[PDB]
Design a protein around this ligand. Structure first.
Ligand SMILES: *[C@@H]1O[C@H](CO)[C@@H](O[C@@H]2O[C@H](CO)[C@@H](O[C@@H]3O[C@H](CO)[C@@H](O)[C@H](O[C@H]4O[C@H](CO)[C@@H](O)[C@H](O)[C@@H]4O)[C@@H]3O)[C@H](O)[C@H]2NC(C)=O)[C@H](O)[C@H]1NC(C)=O
Ligand SMILES: *[C@@H]1O[C@H](CO)[C@@H](O[C@@H]2O[C@H](CO)[C@@H](O[C@@H]3O[C@H](CO)[C@@H](O)[C@H](O)[C@@H]3O)[C@H](O)[C@H]2NC(C)=O)[C@H](O)[C@H]1NC(C)=O
Ligand SMILES: *[C@@H]1O[C@H](CO)[C@@H](O[C@@H]2O[C@H](CO)[C@@H](O)[C@H](O)[C@H]2NC(C)=O)[C@H](O)[C@H]1NC(C)=O
Ligand SMILES: *[C@@H]1O[C@H](CO)[C@@H](O[C@@H]2O[C@H](CO)[C@@H](O)[C@H](O)[C@H]2NC(C)=O)[C@H](O)[C@H]1NC(C)=O
Ligand SMILES: *[C@@H]1O[C@H](CO)[C@@H](O)[C@H](O)[C@H]1NC(C)=O
Ligand SMILES: *[C@@H]1O[C@H](CO)[C@@H](O)[C@H](O)[C@H]1NC(C)=O
Length: 203
């Protein structure tokens, strides 16, 4: 569980909020909003309206950035988004972590979220609980403009200026929530504190 960002719950705030998760359209199997919505249990309209997308049915581009609505809850001082998912042929907790859910979750947390189920083999159409990293804003963050801490998987050769510009987030606010140089969080989930849902650049 190497990730230089603490997803621990808030002491100041409520323990159950509504926030967003940053998803990237993926190469073979995740180029439509309907396909991405199938693993988050919601309509592709909500994803389109959150990602600031005009055409809901418009095919997506690899590494196109989306925003997925999510309900963040606190479980054992740690906060996750409990998401139900039906097992398909060839699925396992590990592969789901690094492909379908693109490193917005751990195999370890995925496993601990389903302690009585098996990670490697599991029958078809059996439902599992995918835990996605998220966090509710501290009351000190709620005092200022901050209303969402958006979960974002730090990509390779990303930087603070680039990320904060896409989301319209304050860098100092961003680094206060993470407190690291982002030198060891590649393909790991970090937090973008925004004041409002950003208008993304879309084709
Ligand atoms: C989530 O984060 C994980 C890191 O924890 C990240 O894992 C990476 O996945 C890719 C793809 O599965 C791995 O890339 C492979 O690297 C090996 C050597 O390390 C290569 O041999 C592979 O080469 C090719 O193999 C095929 C031919 O046999 C080709 O047809 C194919 O196109 C491959 O290019 C391949 O490059 C990478 O090693 C891991 N890295 C780690 C540290 O595990 C994963 O990509 C992240 N997921 C997302 C969605 O971002
Ligand atoms: C959304 O996701 C689904 C599944 O995750 C994707 O379905 C896949 O679609 C391709 C073609 O688009 C299928 O390939 C086909 O294989 C059959 C043989 O089974 C062949 O006869 C066809 O000519 C074609 O090559 C693939 O099987 C299918 N996968 C599954 C599991 O059904 C779909 O493409 C995704 N769509 C988007 C927009 O991302
Ligand atoms: C994640 O959510 C699922 C439901 O969406 C939880 O499972 C349910 O738990 C209640 C509590 O008694 C049961 O009545 C339901 O039958 C369960 N549904 C199932 C198992 O599909 C699950 O407990 C949640 N996980 C965590 C870690 O909070
Ligand atoms: C983060 O994930 C990316 C894949 O999205 C990894 O990039 C791949 O790395 C392997 C090994 O060098 C190459 O064979 C692939 O061609 C790379 N994919 C590209 C360039 O699109 C990257 O290595 C991962 N980084 C970490 C730290 O895990
Ligand atoms: C969590 O906060 C503490 C306080 O310094 C420290 O362990 C670290 O900065 C954070 N954790 C990680 C994995 O960065
Ligand atoms: C973004 O930051 C990385 C280092 O984290 C750097 O290598 C890259 O050149 C930067 N890109 C831009 C456009 O400044």
């Amino acid at each position: 569980y190497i990730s230089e960002t603490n997803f621990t719950c808030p002491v100041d705030s409520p323990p159950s909020c509504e926030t967003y998760v940053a998803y990237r359209a993926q190469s073979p199997n995740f180029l439509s909003l309907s396909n991405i919505s199938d693993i988050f249990n919601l309509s592709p309209l909500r994803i389109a309206k959150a990602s600031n997308i005009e055409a809901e049915d418009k095919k997506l581009i690899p590494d196109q950035l989306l925003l997925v609505p999510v309900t963040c809850g606190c479980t054992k001082n740690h906060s996750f988004a409990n998401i139900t998912y039906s097992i398909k042929q060839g699925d396992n907790f590990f592969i789901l972590s690094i492909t379908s859910y693109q490193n917005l979750t751990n195999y370890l947390e995925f496993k601990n979220f389903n302690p009585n189920l098996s990670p490697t083999l599991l029958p078809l159409d059996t439902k599992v609980s995918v835990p996605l990293f998220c966090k509710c804003p501290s009351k000190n963050q709620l005092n200022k403009g901050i209303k969402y801490l958006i979960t974002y998987v730090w990509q390779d050769n990303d930087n603070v200026t680039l990320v904060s510009s896409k989301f319209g987030a304050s860098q100092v606010e961003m680094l206060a929530e993470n407190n690291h140089n982002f030198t060891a969080s590649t393909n790991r989930s970090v937090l973008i504190p925004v004041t409002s849902l950003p208008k993304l650049d879309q084709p």
